[PDB]
Every structure is written in C-alpha cells, then in structure tokens.
C-alpha cells in the first residue's frame, strides 16, 4: 500500500447496477474471491492480492456480522466486521462506518449475487477526496467457472478500469477455507 496515490476513473455507486431480485438471506453465507479488480487493487505485475472469504452472516437487523479471513501476524485470523444495507438493500455500508473519520462514503453495489451462482462486486470507499474502488468476483465455493471470472474482468472494464489493476484470486496457503 501507500504507492497508488492516484485515482483512476472512479465511479460513484451510481454507475453500478444492483441485483434486481435482492434479498437479506439470499447474500448471508461464505464468499470466497476468485477475482479481484480495481484501481486501489494491489495489482503489481502478478497477483499481490489473494483470496479470502467474505462472510456475511444475518444479524436481528439485517446488520451482516461479516467474516473476513486474512493472514495476519504469521498465521491465520479472521477479521469480523459489519455489513450493513445502504439506503438501499443491495448497496452495502459498514455496520460502524458510520464513526468515519476520513471515509467520505463507503458503499458497495453488488451487480449480481445468487444462492448457486457467483457474485460481482463493485466497491466504493472515498477517504480525503481520494476514492478508492474496485469491482470484485465471489463465488459459491472454491469452484467458480473460469466463465464467470472472465465476466468480472470484463465488468472492472465497464467502470473504466484495466487488466493491470485486475488481479486473479490466488489460492491462500493458510486458513480461510471455512
């Protein structure tokens, strides 16, 4: 990080469509990445980025008591957040974003999620006028059809992003296989 202290063409929430049959218990469950594009993508030359689980699970309030999984220290630790529905369900904001000091809105939309079939993402994090976005590709499990990845790179493009901010999810040697 701290290298990308340029933006490119960033998209607000707006340019990005959202699931048209979303549903709170039809996005709760483990996610993992089998892809990943993006401005703010640590896209090297390689792969810097590599998969994790984003876990959204269903809270009282439809607040996700999300589960991400990251290689921290030397070893494996889930890091749990909050994900909560925008002013719409479909845009998802942080459950304690809300205290941000520097954040200007964080919002993600995602274009298309299935119980079955794969998901795409695009996230939205603006902090200090920089904005910072990527569109992401979750599957259903470790076992997503190269047809699917293929679509996300072409939906990082419809944002205006490029292959060299586009990495491919590579398969974590550490916990994260929930």
């Known amino acids: 990080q701290d290298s990308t202290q340029n933006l490119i063409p960033a998209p607000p929430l707006i340019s990005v469509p959202l699931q048209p049959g979303f549903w709170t218990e039809r996005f709760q469950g483990r996610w993992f ?28 309030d439809n607040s ?26 479909g845009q998802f904001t942080l459950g304690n974003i809300h205290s941000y000091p520097q954040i200007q809105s964080y919002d993600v939309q995602v274009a298309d999620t299935d119980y079955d079939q794969f998901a795409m993402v695009f996230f939205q994090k603006t902090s200090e006028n920089k904005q910072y976005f990527k569109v992401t590709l979750y599957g259903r499990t470790k076992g997503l059809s190269d047809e699917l990845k293929e679509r996300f790179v072409s939906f990082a493009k419809s944002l205006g992003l490029k292959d060299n901010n586009i990495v491919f999810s590579v398969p974590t040697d550490q916990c994260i296989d929930n």
């Open 33 to 60: 990445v089998v892809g990943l594009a993006g401005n703010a993508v640590q896209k090297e030359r390689q792969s810097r980025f590599t998969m994790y689980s984003t876990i959204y699970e269903l809270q009282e």
């Open 64 to 89: 996700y008591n999300v589960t991400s999984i990251l290689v921290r220290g030397q070893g494996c630790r889930y890091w749990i957040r909050t994900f909560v529905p925008s002013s719409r369900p």
